């Protein structure tokens, strides 16, 4: 009368961990910060320094 052996069933699908490769990971990053508001020079003074001849 042989004793009962063990029996440890395993589903082959329980191996998958739905983890992306670290180049596709977005939600674990600290999406904190609002990086200012830059309103570029409406007037480019660069071309405001020329008078040429002493016109009357």
């Amino acid at each position: 009368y042989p004793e009962i052996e063990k029996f440890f069933p395993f589903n082959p699908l329980d191996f998958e961990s739905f983890d992306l490769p670290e180049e596709h990971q977005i939600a674990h990053l600290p999406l904190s910060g609002v990086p200012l508001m830059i309103l570029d020079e409406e007037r480019e003074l660069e071309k405001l320094f020329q008078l040429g001849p002493p016109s009357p």
């Binding site: 029996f7 069933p9 082959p12 910060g33 002493p54």
Partner: protein, 1445 residues
């Protein structure tokens, strides 16, 4: 002449000289000179001499001329009575000089002129000083005009000389330096004690003169003296604080100051420049809130330049500090201007803006009703500066507190009529930033939750919180405020319209992220309105590009063309050769490529797209370029999803040569690039810091859109693991940002992905979650509140009504599922029509051609598919030919797009016509096959290949074999292509020919141009030519006549090297035993095993084990007898010796006489190679099948042939690779009686054998070429410490072995198990399953696999088949990573019996000696364990035969 006569003579002589000048004569002047010579005797004589000298100088018009000028000045100096006469004389001399502007003047001539001018000036000033000159208002004015007239002439000469002054003549300019600065001194003194009007007009020319005088040096890099020239005026003008010069043009005063400030700032001296800006504003003290702007810009320019030089102390010198005594309102306006100018720079000025806002809060008195306004405006600016980098060392006010205080102050303000526009502006801006900083609060709250570590339905219902109504309402009101501001058509009259433009950009980005696309459309229309009002065509072009991209994301491509044309029209007005123009031009080209794609003019679109893809401007490092590459990659994926008949062949080659071979690869690269952008935002020298704010909410919206594309695509392909991975990533992001609509979308997607894997519980959980979220979103036919108005919500609702019908049909309700599908059938048309009307009203056009075909078309196509699949099970000959015809027509109007659904509908039509008609089925299915061959749906591709290889068979041998070959392991093929692309990417980034070769081997569109079966057949013939020697490939496949069933007819296709493909059809549908029954019995055995292993009575336990083993051996015997029957020598080797071939020829002819259609030789050559073991009943069935008309003499002839071929030998060196379907892989074919002595392994697809060969050609696979070493082995013995019975014995024998470095009892670190697979030849795992916990499929796929994997666990090499999806398991990831051989169990086994098996295998193989076949010892060790069929038939091998070295 008497004194009076002499005075009259001077007047007459001057008149004579003036008369000579009156006609510009010289001979007459000579006559007057003779008259003067006659008068020569006086004070007027020197004066007359000067006039004569002037005439001589006029005649000269060089060195002598210079000497004459000096001589004139010298005599004039002595004269200056005589000085009074010298004036009239100097006027004549100056008249000659006026006509002597030869421009060819040298500093010496200018110095001589300066001498004469200075002498005249001294005499003129003395004459003007004389009370008489001042006494006569006009007379003083006349002398004053004369002085200024002379100075105007002087600077003209100076500028003429400065123009003549070149790089070499700079020394000459430095010579004129003296007179220039002295000139300024004289000019200022001339303005002393002057009448207001006279002083102001003279001030204008005075400043103008020095501006021209100073500019010359500045225009030649000589600031020091340029500053010395303007220093006196700037100081005098600045010191006189009283505004005594209100009229003097601010435009002039500006120039002089501007010049000195630049001269100092270009020479450092930032401190002096700051004081000069203070003096500048001091001069413009009582000016308008307009002229003060330029000084303030120069302030910020001097301040920012100071920072570059480390002049941090300039920041310490602030305006409020510098301009101590200034009217509050004026200082508040000046600090507003400084705030705006700081907003204009690009170099981390957050702290400076914070200082300005703090001082503006301190200066604005909250008491005044006109101070509450300034309080609120500075508070929204403080909110802006705090949602960026919150300052905990100052203020002690939170950002969400500042903004709410501002909103209350604004609600307390009442305007009149001129400021209502400013009120609407600031209120809308406050509401926008209220939303922004509530979202930042949510972000940091989630960050704190996730940081709380110490030492998801609930999460969804918690994050919902019914807070959507609070936040979205504020943006919905900011939009209305901006709209009432900008829609009137009149001028806006706001502070900075640029700020309105930037806020509208942020609002469009935010709406895109909250998934409200129509609101973003309206916001972009208003941004285009404002952009024309501001004459900024960059922004108009960008707004039109965005409107076009958003209209193409929706259905309507007609309205996108108008706005693309508008974008081009705005592009005309740009500089070109500038990054803005390059970017907007590439964007418009991309939009036109997409318009061609949707307009079915695909070849011009591909030409455009390849022009875009080959531009070196698309690769320059900047974030807008990365967004453009993202859109490029999504368009490339949209072009890779078209059938090959739409495009030419070289077009496909050059399109795939860019680096992206499938839409999945393109979309994952899009996702990767979208992540790399965020690493740049949420961190440079701030060069690209211009659009970071809008980009931060554009990148998140694009991430969610890319994830929707990458999830809806990978799930339709059947790859549900990666699809769920991306779906979970996006759900995590959306719960982080707390966006209900996007998370509802992604929950419905995850529900469909779980329904694909037959998980009704998880799908119903997700469905209830989205029902909760949709009840939250709605504000609680033609209008269903917020749901109907929004397209995204109607889409998510119809996807709910689709996945719910799918679940309702999976559990088996039918009527309810059909009613839900018919609801989805009436839902998409009305949804598209209401979106059409909404888009027309929003853009304000007339009659949009055709309805909007967005994702509603795809969901209606899937509804048609699922409603056609249910007419098969209820073939009542009614609404089946009327639901499939309508679906076919629908899907046939949009030809290049809805292609998988037309293939599904064609397959269903073929299955309905199945029960000439065979040719009709074949052509229909060939249409479908070419419809999905480029990127197959894995589940449809199998049904389509096997139905097409069943209709078309023996009438076309090679084509039938090719279809059977492609119907296996499609998902593994997709995954291998993706893995190879990732390998190429990482290998290029780290620093490959075999990689590209394998990619070509697995590619879906590496075909030539052809009709229906020809180019496919040619590629298949090449692949057949690639088979190695000594290997037989049997592809067993179940031909399924319904999608979702099992099937009975076994398609067996044998593949050899230099032999035609021999295929056979084994219809096991009447053979009593069936094959469905075999699979049912196997499932029953595996269920009974686990239900029995719970009993504790050892006797009943062993009885059940024995009964299951007997059942298992009966099943194995039945496979060979009934399942294969006579057609079972197709798996046996081929006789190298002649004999079968000659008999094959003779029998071919003679049986062809007997009525054998499709006579073939290789079939009989392989069926007679095993004649030694051929039984009379096999010969009976074979004969009665081959030759039905005259069978008896066919048997007799076959009996004679086998009797003549009685003695033979199968080849010693040979091998059989079994390619099984997803349903037949679980049966233990390797343990059938016939295949017990024969080496037999498995592979996923036939292409994997060729891949192993290709890798063997180059290396990287030492074991499959050299041999396994007895040493060099890593073992994992009992890592979970459950099984000690094994642990003890296996510990003894393993430790006894030399060179074996492993673990025992403990779970191995992932690093050492990585090194175990990589650096070793053998990986003996004695434990639970297949590693899994410490080594999962992704970790090995990320790895190279050198070692043989002897994984001795329960279901180690089993593939889990869930639903209509193909098998998944870690063995696939092992052999996709290059594992030569992978041994593992197939079903659950027990402990000590599997230990006995493992001990036998390891004692037989290891220790046999060098060159010991492993597959020989897996069958030799299969007779050691007690239950020889229940735990002996379980071990299975994947790969190629290996041997010990």
């Amino acid at each position: 002449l008497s004194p009076q006569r002499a005075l009259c003579l001077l007047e007459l002589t001057l008149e004579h000289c003036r008369r000579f000048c009156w006609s510009r004569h010289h001979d007459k002047a000579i006559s007057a000179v003779e008259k003067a010579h006659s008068y020569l005797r006086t004070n007027l004589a020197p004066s007359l001499q000067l006039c004569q000298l002037g005439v001589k100088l006029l005649q000269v018009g060089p060195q002598a001329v210079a000497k004459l000028l000096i001589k004139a000045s010298a005599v004039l100096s002595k004269s200056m009575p005589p000085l009074r006469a010298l004036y009239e004389s100097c006027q004549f001399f100056l008249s000659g000089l006026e006509r002597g502007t030869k421009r060819r003047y040298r500093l010496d001539a200018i110095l001589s002129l300066f001498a004469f001018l200075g002498g005249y000036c001294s005499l003129l000033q003395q004459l003007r000083d004389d009370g008489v000159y001042g006494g006569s208002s006009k007379q003083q004015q006349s002398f004053l005009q004369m002085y200024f007239q002379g100075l105007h002439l002087y600077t003209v000469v100076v500028y003429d000389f400065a123009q003549g002054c070149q790089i070499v003549d700079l020394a000459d300019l430095t010579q004129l330096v003296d007179s220039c600065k002295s000139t300024v001194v004289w000019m200022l003194e001339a303005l002393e004690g002057l009448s207001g009007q006279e002083l102001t007009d003279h001030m204008g020319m005075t400043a103008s003169y020095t501006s021209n005088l100073a500019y010359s040096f500045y225009s030649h890099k000589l600031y020091a003296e340029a500053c010395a020239i303007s220093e006196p005026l700037c100081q005098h003008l600045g010191l006189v604080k009283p505004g005594t010069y209100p009229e003097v043009p601010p435009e002039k005063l500006h120039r002089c100051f501007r010049l000195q400030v630049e001269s100092l700032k270009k020479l450092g001296k930032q401190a002096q420049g700051c004081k000069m800006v203070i003096l500048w504003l001091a001069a413009l003290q009582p000016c308008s809130p307009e002229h003060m702007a330029e000084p303030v810009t120069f302030w910020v320019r001097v301040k920012m330049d100071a920072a570059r030089a480390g002049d941090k102390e300039l920041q310490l010198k602030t305006l409020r500090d510098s301009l101590s005594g200034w009217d509050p309102e004026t200082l508040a306006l000046l600090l507003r201007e400084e705030l705006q100018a700081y907003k204009a720079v690009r170099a981390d000025t957050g702290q400076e803006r914070f200082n300005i806002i703090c001082d503006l809060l301190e200066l604005s008195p909250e008491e005044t009703p006109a101070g509450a306004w300034a309080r609120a405006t500075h508070l929204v600016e403080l909110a802006q500066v705090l949602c960026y980098h919150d300052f905990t060392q100052q203020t002690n006010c939170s950002a969400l507190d500042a903004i709410r205080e501002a909103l209350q102050l604004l609600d307390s303000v009442r305007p009149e009529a001129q400021a209502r526009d400013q009120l609407l502006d600031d209120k809308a801006q406050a509401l926008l930033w209220l939303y922004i900083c509530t979202l930042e609060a949510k972000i940091q709250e989630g960050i704190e939750r996730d940081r709380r570590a110490q030492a998801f339905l609930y999460s969804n219902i918690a994050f919902n919180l019914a807070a959507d109504a609070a936040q979205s309402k504020c943006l919905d009101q900011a939009l209305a405020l901006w709209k009432e501001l900008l829609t009137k058509g009149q001028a806006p009259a706001v502070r900075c319209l640029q700020q309105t433009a930037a806020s509208l950009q942020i609002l469009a980005a935010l709406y895109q992220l909250v998934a409200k696309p129509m609101q973003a459309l309206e916001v972009l229309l208003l941004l285009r309105i404002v952009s024309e009002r501001l004459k900024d065509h960059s922004k108009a072009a960008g707004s039109s590009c965005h409107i076009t991209q958003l209209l193409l994301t929706l259905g309507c491509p007609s309205y996108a063309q108008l706005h693309l044309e508008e974008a081009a029209s705005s592009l005309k007005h740009l500089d070109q050769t500038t990054d803005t123009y390059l970017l907007l031009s590439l964007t418009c080209d991309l939009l036109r490529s997409q318009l061609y794609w949707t307009h079915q003019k695909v070849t011009k679109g591909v030409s455009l797209l390849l022009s875009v893809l080959r531009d070196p401007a698309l690769q320059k490092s900047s974030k807008a370029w990365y967004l453009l590459r993202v859109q490029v990659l999504q368009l490339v994926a949209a072009y890779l999803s078209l059938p090959s008949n739409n495009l030419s062949h070289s077009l496909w080659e050059q399109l795939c040569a860019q680096g992206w071979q499938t839409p999945e690869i393109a979309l994952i690269d899009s996702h990767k690039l979208l992540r790399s952008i965020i690493l740049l935002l949420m961190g440079t020298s701030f060069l690209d810091y211009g659009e970071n704010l809008v980009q931060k909410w554009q990148v998140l919206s694009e991430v969610l859109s890319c994830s929707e594309k990458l999830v809806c695509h990978l799930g339709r392909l059947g790859s549900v693991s990666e699809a769920k991975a991306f779906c979970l990533e996006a759900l995590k992001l959306t719960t982080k940002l707390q966006i209900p609509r996007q998370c509802a979308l992604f929950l419905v997607l995850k529900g469909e992905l779980e329904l694909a894997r037959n998980d009704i519980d998880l799908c119903q959980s997700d469905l209830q979650q989205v029902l909760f979220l949709l009840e939250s979103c709605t504000e609680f036919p033609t209008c269903d509140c917020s749901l109907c108005a929004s397209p995204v919500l109607t889409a998510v609702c119809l996807r709910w009504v689709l996945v719910t019908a799918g679940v309702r049909l999976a559990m088996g309700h039918q009527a309810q599922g059909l009613d839900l599908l018919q609801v989805v059938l009436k839902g998409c048309p009305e949804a598209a029509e209401r979106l059409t009307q909404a888009l027309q009203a929003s853009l304000n056009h007339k009659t949009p051609p055709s309805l909007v075909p967005s994702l509603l078309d795809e969901i209606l196509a899937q509804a048609y598919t699922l409603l056609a699949l249910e007419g098969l099970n209820q073939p009542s000959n009614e609404s089946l030919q009327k639901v499939l015809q309508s679906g076919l027509k629908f899907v046939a109007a949009r030809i290049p797009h809805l292609e998988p659904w037309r293939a599904s509908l064609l397959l269903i039509w073929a299955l309905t016509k199945l029960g000439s008609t065979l040719d009709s089925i074949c052509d229909s299915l060939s249409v479908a096959f070419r419809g999905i061959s480029h990127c197959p749906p894995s589940g449809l591709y199998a049904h389509l290949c096997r139905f097409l290889a069943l209709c078309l068979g023996h009438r076309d041998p090679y084509a039938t074999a090719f279809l059977v070959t492609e119907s296996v392991s499609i998902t593994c093929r997709h995954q291998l292509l993706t893995h190879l692309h990732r390998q190429l990417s990482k290998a290029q980034k780290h620093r490959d020919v075999p990689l590209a070769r394998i990619q070509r081997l697995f590619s879906f569109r590496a075909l030539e141009s052809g009709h229906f079966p020809q180019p496919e057949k040619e590629s298949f013939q090449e692949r057949l030519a690639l088979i190695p020697s000594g290997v037989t490939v049997c592809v067993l496949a179940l031909a399924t006549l319904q999608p979702g069933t099992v099937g009975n007819t076994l398609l067996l296709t044998r593949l050899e090297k230099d032999s035609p493909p021999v295929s056979v059809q084994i219809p096991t549908g009447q053979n009593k035993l069936h094959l469905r029954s075999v699979l049912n019995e196997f499932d029953a055995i595996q269920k009974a095993q686990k239900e029995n292993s719970s009993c504790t009575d050892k006797r009943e336990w062993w009885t059940g084990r024995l009964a299951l083993d007997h059942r298992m051996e009966v099943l194995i015997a039945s496979l060979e007898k009934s399942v294969l029957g006579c057609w079972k020598g197709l798996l046996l080797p081929s006789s190298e010796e002649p004999g079968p071939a000659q008999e094959a020829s003779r029998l071919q002819e003679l049986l062809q006489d007997c009525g054998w259609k499709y006579p073939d030789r290789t079939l009989l050559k392989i069926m007679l190679s095993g004649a030694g073991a051929l039984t009379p009943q096999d010969i009976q069935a074979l004969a009665y099948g081959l030759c039905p008309t005259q069978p008896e003499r066919a048997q007799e002839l076959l009996n004679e042939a086998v009797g003549r071929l009685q003695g033979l030998t199968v080849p010693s060196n040979s091998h059989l690779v079994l390619v099984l379907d997803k349903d037949l892989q679980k049966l233990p074919w390797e343990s059938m009686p016939s295949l017990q002595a024969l080496p037999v392994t498995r592979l996923p697809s036939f292409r994997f054998l060729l891949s192993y060969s290709i890798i063997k050609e180059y290396g990287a696979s030492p074991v499959l070429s050299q041999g396994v070493d007895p040493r060099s082995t890593f073992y994992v013995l009992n890592p979970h410490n459950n099984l000690s019975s094994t642990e003890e014995q296996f510990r003894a024998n393993f430790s006894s072995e030399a060179g074996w470095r492993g673990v025992v009892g403990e779970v191995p670190r992932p690093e050492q198990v990585q090194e175990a697979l990589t650096k070793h030849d053998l990986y003996i795992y004695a434990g639970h399953g297949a590693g899994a916990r410490f080594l999962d499929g992704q970790a090995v796929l990320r790895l190279s696999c050198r070692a043989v994997a002897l994984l001795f666990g329960c279901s180690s090499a089993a593939l889990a088949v869930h639903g209509n999806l193909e098998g998944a398991g870690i063995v696939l990831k092992y052999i996709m990573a290059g594992c030569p051989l992978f041994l593992g169990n197939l079903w659950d086994v027990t402990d000590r019996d599997i230990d006995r098996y493992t001990e036998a295998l390891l004692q037989g193989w290891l220790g046999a000696g060098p060159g010991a076949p492993l597959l020989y010892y897996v069958n030799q060790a299969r007779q050691a364990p007690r239950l020889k069929y229940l735990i002996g038939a379980a071990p299975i091998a994947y790969g190629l035969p290996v041997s010990l070295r």
